[PDB]
Write a protein that binds this ligand. Structure first.
Ligand SMILES: C=CC1=C(C)/C(=C/c2[nH]c(/C=C3N=C(/C=C4\NC(=O)C(C)=C4C=C)C(C)=C\3CCC(=O)O)c(CCC(=O)O)c2C)NC1=O
Ligand SMILES: *[C@@H]1O[C@H](CO)[C@@H](O[C@@H]2O[C@H](CO)[C@@H](O)[C@H](O)[C@H]2NC(C)=O)[C@H](O)[C@H]1NC(C)=O
Ligand SMILES: *[C@@H]1O[C@H](CO)[C@@H](O)[C@H](O)[C@H]1NC(C)=O
Ligand SMILES: *[C@@H]1O[C@H](CO)[C@@H](O)[C@H](O)[C@H]1NC(C)=O
Ligand SMILES: *[C@@H]1O[C@H](CO)[C@@H](O)[C@H](O)[C@H]1NC(C)=O
Ligand SMILES: *[C@@H]1O[C@H](CO)[C@@H](O)[C@H](O)[C@H]1NC(C)=O
Ligand SMILES: *[C@@H]1O[C@H](CO)[C@@H](O)[C@H](O)[C@H]1NC(C)=O
Ligand SMILES: *[C@@H]1O[C@H](CO)[C@@H](O)[C@H](O)[C@H]1NC(C)=O
Ligand SMILES: *[C@@H]1O[C@H](CO)[C@@H](O)[C@H](O)[C@H]1NC(C)=O
Ligand SMILES: *[C@@H]1O[C@H](CO)[C@@H](O)[C@H](O)[C@H]1NC(C)=O
Ligand SMILES: *[C@@H]1O[C@H](CO)[C@@H](O)[C@H](O)[C@H]1NC(C)=O
Ligand SMILES: *[C@@H]1O[C@H](CO)[C@@H](O)[C@H](O)[C@H]1NC(C)=O
Ligand SMILES: *[C@@H]1O[C@H](CO)[C@@H](O)[C@H](O)[C@H]1NC(C)=O
Ligand SMILES: *[C@@H]1O[C@H](CO)[C@@H](O)[C@H](O)[C@H]1NC(C)=O
Ligand SMILES: *[C@@H]1O[C@H](CO)[C@@H](O)[C@H](O)[C@H]1NC(C)=O
Lengths: 241, 423, 171, 185
């Protein structure tokens, strides 16, 4: 039991084609679930904070093309911060800045990839004792450019990546993408969910990987699976909570 | 009734459960010397727990002894398994087979998984298998073997049968007295109220029905597996209690961790003692709960074993007049069969069938006196009046030997005028 | 609970495998036997857990290979004795030792497997008496004549036979 | 006695406290830190009493089962004659006598054990004529030359009589029937 995204929960899908662009500031309540369905490297990173103005400081976690940088600075953010191709059009000024280092050396080009969506990159961001914990998993997921905007089936366990000591209050967060040559960005999509304090049962296989988790206290059948510590329930009557 | 059915039905009775012993110092502490001391203050409780478990383990062998070792004369299995047309081969051991058990006993032993000897190298070389028995034994939970092996229990069963096939009911009371099986079957028929001439007149049919019922029993336990559910539940409860005991070692019991190594490595010996004492109290409580539930299950198993010993004495070693005690119907014979953690009784019963309506009278007014039937009832087929036994339609001429005279015929309600033969 | 890069200065000895040792892996102490493991840790994991919370595996911090941790204490032990003020010699039954040819206290002079474990200190006899001290799996023991502890297969009862005939009865 | 003495001996357990003696704790500590040790001792001793009471309940259930069986044996073996095999002693039960014992009862079961058996050639029935004769009680026995009818549990031979036997059907159906004569008074 901890902070998890509930099964079959209300999550918001945000779409990107050459005519629309949606980067609205989602609330950061008890942790969020983030997942980008993308054929290229569009969603560069995120901005975490409270007001996202220069009165308070903010977290700038993003990929510049070759490294994953985190900056806990107080920014004068431009309205709708973006990347003009590889050029960062993020902030006008940055001062009083308490954290600036690179987390990983990940080469991610800004080139547009034609075709259909290829991979889904799933993230879990949660705040624990002033540190931003990042959980990450990447799965191949072929999605077309029409008639379906759903999440993949099954489970994919997100491994713990980083513990960033940002040390500040986070209530809102904003996604940033790259704008190509200052036009409306290419085909991309991202989903924002919200974690809740739930119990959940995880099944580990013989190799140690999590497969087929279940959400305890979602329906009485799941609570029976929780109590039985099993994913197979025999026929009969079962007392629940 | 004008006919009958020879019915053989099974009754599955648990007799013994798994004997177990617990090393407290191995369960409460893994190998921690720091936990071995401060457990000396709780040694009386662990001697109490092991005393209760030893009493249960001794009572299990006492339960097995009181059911199967009723007679101490191990009668030899005869070379011929046919006793007046009655085929005893499926319930007696086959000398041509390597196993010294009956075919029915082999089917019974194949129907229980028996998942509770081991070696340290076996658990050391099979870590990736994650065996439950290795996890039980690494925490000081051992399973003790029963005193009687399955071969000796099968030998006791094969001595109980063929002591009743060759000497019948007369070896549980004194020395065995041999008797032909047809005459002993006639005695059993006389025991249920059927005249023995019915058995001699329908010996081939009765033997064929008995063999067919034995074959029906054999096929119902090469098919469905829910018949041995009581023994399987005994095995499953004994395994589940030990697995719960193993799983309950992950409880923190209010301490900072449920791991003794973590507490010892992070804390010095002023603050590790508090968490270690909390873990000791919790694990001792878990062991006490396990021992208490084992005592409850041992009491239930002992009640079942006492009932099984009573059925061994009254259904196998004799013919019982008690209704439904030795199967449904009029009891004729019972044959024990050795099963894992229990016994299976093959109850041979007499089921009357194919009844016919008859006009009946309580008594016959032949003259100024009244005639009452000695054994049986007065029946009429429409024209003439006969007297027959109750459990089989055998109409006989109403004579003075068939009836007796008591009083006048003006006081019996339902009295019927008819002649009575006098030779 | 996790891989660590800041440690106190203690030592770094060599790995001792297939032997009960006092281990200390990244500050986690304990006693057990270390063996090579077919487990693949996911590079954020340093310790492994069984169905309890016992640390049954560990990732070695120098050579990043997983080692299994098993307790070195194992196997049921029983003592067979006659009464005190009858004898002082005993027989020891090691339930989880196969000595048919060890993890025993003493090698003795009498060894044979009983299907209830290895029996040391009691000589096998071919006779079959009634049970005096139950060992298990059909084996019993008694103090029998110079006096010694002997182990034997228990006798189920007197051997008997009924002369069955189809025309003979016993009255 | 062992349960009571174990209850007495378990008062020496510390139960995680600094001492198993209340007087030592009260003499060394004031009432803020003696309270936790006294509470630990209270919890441990209450647990010991609960364990004793639970084991007493289990033993009382076993004793009640034994007493119910003893009352059934008093009803069926002492106050009557039981036809149940091995319920009142080994053998054919005649009578039983209860004897008072400390914490129980001792039954003296008087039983009939037949002995000194003899071999006899036997037949299921007698084909005296076109009809067949079956024994009313007991079995047909032969001493080598003549045929008799005796009761089952005792050798008391007597000549075959129409009152001793009964007639049912012809004699070509019974397997093992022998030829003899039946006396008619
Ligand atoms: C901004 C955060 C961010 C995270 C959390 C991140 C994690 C991350 N990205 C990876 C690969 C990768 N992931 C990406 C790209 C991305 N994947 C993403 O999560 C995002 C947002 C991008 C960039 C837009 C690519 C292209 C690689 C490198 C593949 C390779 O060259 O082998 C890997 C695997 C590295 C390895 O196996 O050696 C990790 C752990 N990368 C990031 O850039
Ligand atoms: C920790 O240091 C040890 C000792 O130097 C390293 O073990 C050596 O590794 C090299 C390179 O693989 C081998 O050629 C040597 O044979 C190893 N020596 C011994 C004694 O094992 C080890 O690789 C280092 N580990 C890390 C994670 O840096
Ligand atoms: C802070 O933001 C305000 C607008 O809210 C702007 O006028 C001002 O110049 C900014 N100051 C700095 C130092 O960036
Ligand atoms: C972080 O440091 C890099 C150089 O290491 C610098 O280019 C960058 O501007 C810094 N970010 C700030 C001050 O926000
Ligand atoms: C575990 O991994 C092996 C390869 O190392 C693979 O063959 C096997 O299928 C995996 N097991 C599961 C349950 O996925
Ligand atoms: C009794 O039933 C059996 C089996 O069906 C049959 O063979 C037999 O003829 C029946 N007997 C009578 C008298 O009907
Ligand atoms: C008894 O039955 C078995 C099969 O069940 C058969 O092989 C055997 O011949 C039968 N015996 C007799 C005497 O018919
Ligand atoms: C006996 O008579 C009753 C009442 O008429 C009838 O229902 C029943 O079937 C009869 N039983 C027979 C013929 O066996
Ligand atoms: C009843 O049975 C007798 C037997 O002698 C027979 O003569 C008579 O006809 C029968 N009556 C019937 C079937 O109504
Ligand atoms: C039997 O019952 C019938 C029908 O009710 C009745 O007429 C008759 O008197 C009764 N006979 C006796 C003897 O009670
Ligand atoms: C002991 O080892 C022998 C080696 O031949 C093996 O046959 C046997 O099954 C093992 N176990 C026992 C309990 O004897
Ligand atoms: C005991 O029996 C075994 C097995 O048959 C035999 O080898 C041995 O010599 C016997 N010992 C005696 C008779 O002393
Ligand atoms: C009866 O006959 C059998 C078989 O011949 C024989 O063993 C026995 O001694 C005889 N006598 C008695 C009294 O049983
Ligand atoms: C059998 O008994 C009869 C009647 O007492 C007697 O005459 C006869 O001699 C006996 N036969 C033998 C062989 O003892
Ligand atoms: C009794 O058995 C013998 C020996 O097999 C046989 O010759 C005889 O016919 C049998 N008698 C019967 C079945 O009446």
């Amino acid at each position: 039991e901890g902070f998890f995204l509930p099964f079959d929960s209300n999550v918001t899908w945000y779409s990107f084609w050459n005519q629309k662009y949606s980067v609205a500031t989602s609330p950061f309540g008890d942790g969020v679930y983030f997942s980008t369905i993308d054929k290229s490297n569009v969603v560069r990173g995120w901005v975490f904070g409270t007001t996202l103005d220069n009165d308070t400081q903010s977290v700038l976690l993003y990929n510049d093309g070759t490294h994953v940088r985190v900056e806990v600075c107080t920014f004068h953010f431009c309205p709708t911060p973006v990347f003009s191709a590889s050029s960062p059009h993020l902030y006008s000024s940055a001062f009083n800045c308490t954290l600036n280092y690179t987390l990983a050396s990940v080469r991610a080009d800004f080139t547009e990839v034609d075709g259909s969506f290829k991979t889904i990159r799933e993230f879990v961001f949660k705040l624990q004792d002033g540190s931003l914990n990042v959980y990450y998993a990447s799965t191949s997921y072929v999605l077309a450019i029409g008639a379906t905007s759903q999440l993949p089936s099954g489970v994919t366990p997100l491994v713990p990546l980083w513990k960033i000591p940002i040390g500040l209050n986070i209530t809102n967060f904003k996604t940033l993408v790259y704008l190509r040559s200052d036009n409306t960005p290419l085909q991309a999509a991202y989903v924002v969910g919200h974690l809740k304090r739930r119990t959940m049962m995880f099944k580990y296989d013989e190799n140690g990987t999590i497969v087929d988790a279940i959400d305890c206290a979602l329906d009485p059948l799941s609570e029976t699976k929780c109590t039985l510590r099993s994913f197979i329930v025999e026929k009969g009557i079962y007392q629940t909570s | 009734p004008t006919n009958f059915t020879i019915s053989v039905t099974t009754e599955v009775m648990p007799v013994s459960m798994t004997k177990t012993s617990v090393d407290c110092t191995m369960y409460i502490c893994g190998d921690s010397v720091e936990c071995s001391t401060l457990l000396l203050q709780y040694g009386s409780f662990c001697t109490q727990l092991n005393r209760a478990l030893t009493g249960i383990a001794v009572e299990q062998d006492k339960n097995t002894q009181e059911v199967f070792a009723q007679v101490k004369q191990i009668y030899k299995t005869p070379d011929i398994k046919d006793f007046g047309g009655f085929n005893f081969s499926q319930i007696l051991p086959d000398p041509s087979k390597p196993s010294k058990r009956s075919f029915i006993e082999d089917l019974l032993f194949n129907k229980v998984t028996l998942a509770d000897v081991k070696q340290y190298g076996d658990c050391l070389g099979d870590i990736q298998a994650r065996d439950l028995i290795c996890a039980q034994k690494f925490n000081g939970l051992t399973v003790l073997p029963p005193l009687l092996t399955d071969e000796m229990i099968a030998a006791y069963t094969a001595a109980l049968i063929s002591g009743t096939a060759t000497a019948g009911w007369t070896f549980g009371a004194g020395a065995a007295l041999q008797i032909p099986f047809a005459m002993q079957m006639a005695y059993r028929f006389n025991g249920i109220g059927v005249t023995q001439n019915v058995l001699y007149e329908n010996q081939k049919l009765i033997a064929n029905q008995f063999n067919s019922a034995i074959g029906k029993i054999q096929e119902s336990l090469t098919s469905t597996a829910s018949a041995l559910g009581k023994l399987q539940d005994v095995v499953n409860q004994n395994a589940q209690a030990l697995n719960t005991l193993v799983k309950q070692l992950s409880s923190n019991f209010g301490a900072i961790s449920s791991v003794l190594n973590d507490i010892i490595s992070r804390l010095d010996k002023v603050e590790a003692e508090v968490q270690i004492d909390r873990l000791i109290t919790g694990r001792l409580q878990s062991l006490q709960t396990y021992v208490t539930q084992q005592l409850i299950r041992a009491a239930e198993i002992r009640a079942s074993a006492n009932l099984a010993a009573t059925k061994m004495s009254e259904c196998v070693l004799g013919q019982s007049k008690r209704v439904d005690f030795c199967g449904k119907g009029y009891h004729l014979m019972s044959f024990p069969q050795a099963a894992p953690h229990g016994v299976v009784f093959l109850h041979v019963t007499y089921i009357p069938s194919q009844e016919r309506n008859f006009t009946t009278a309580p008594a016959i007014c032949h003259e100024g006196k009244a005639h009452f039937p000695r054994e049986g009832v007065f029946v009429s087929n429409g024209t003439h009046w006969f007297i027959t036994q109750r459990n089989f339609y055998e109409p006989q001429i109403i004579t003075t030997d068939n009836t007796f005279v008591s009083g006048t015929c003006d006081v019996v309600i339902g009295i019927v005028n008819n002649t009575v033969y006098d030779p | 609970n996790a891989p660590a890069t800041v440690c106190g200065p203690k030592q770094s000895t060599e790995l001792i495998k297939n032997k009960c040792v006092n281990f200390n892996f990244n500050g986690l102490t304990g006693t057990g036997v270390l063996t090579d493991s077919n487990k693949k840790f996911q590079s954020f994991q340093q310790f492994g857990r069984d169905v309890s919370d016992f640390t049954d595996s560990v990732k070695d911090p120098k050579t990043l290979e997983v080692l299994d941790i098993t307790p070195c204490s194992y196997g049921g032990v029983s003592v067979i004795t006659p009464g005190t003020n009858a004898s002082t010699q005993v027989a020891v039954l090691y339930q989880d030792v196969n000595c048919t040819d060890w993890r025993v206290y003493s090698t003795g002079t009498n060894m044979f497997q009983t299907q209830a474990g290895c029996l040391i200190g009691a000589e096998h006899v071919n006779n079959s008496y009634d049970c005096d001290i139950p060992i298990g799996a059909g084996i019993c023991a008694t103090y029998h004549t110079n006096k010694r502890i002997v182990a034997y297969v228990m006798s189920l009862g007197a051997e008997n036979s009924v002369a069955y005939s189809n025309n003979t009865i016993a009255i």
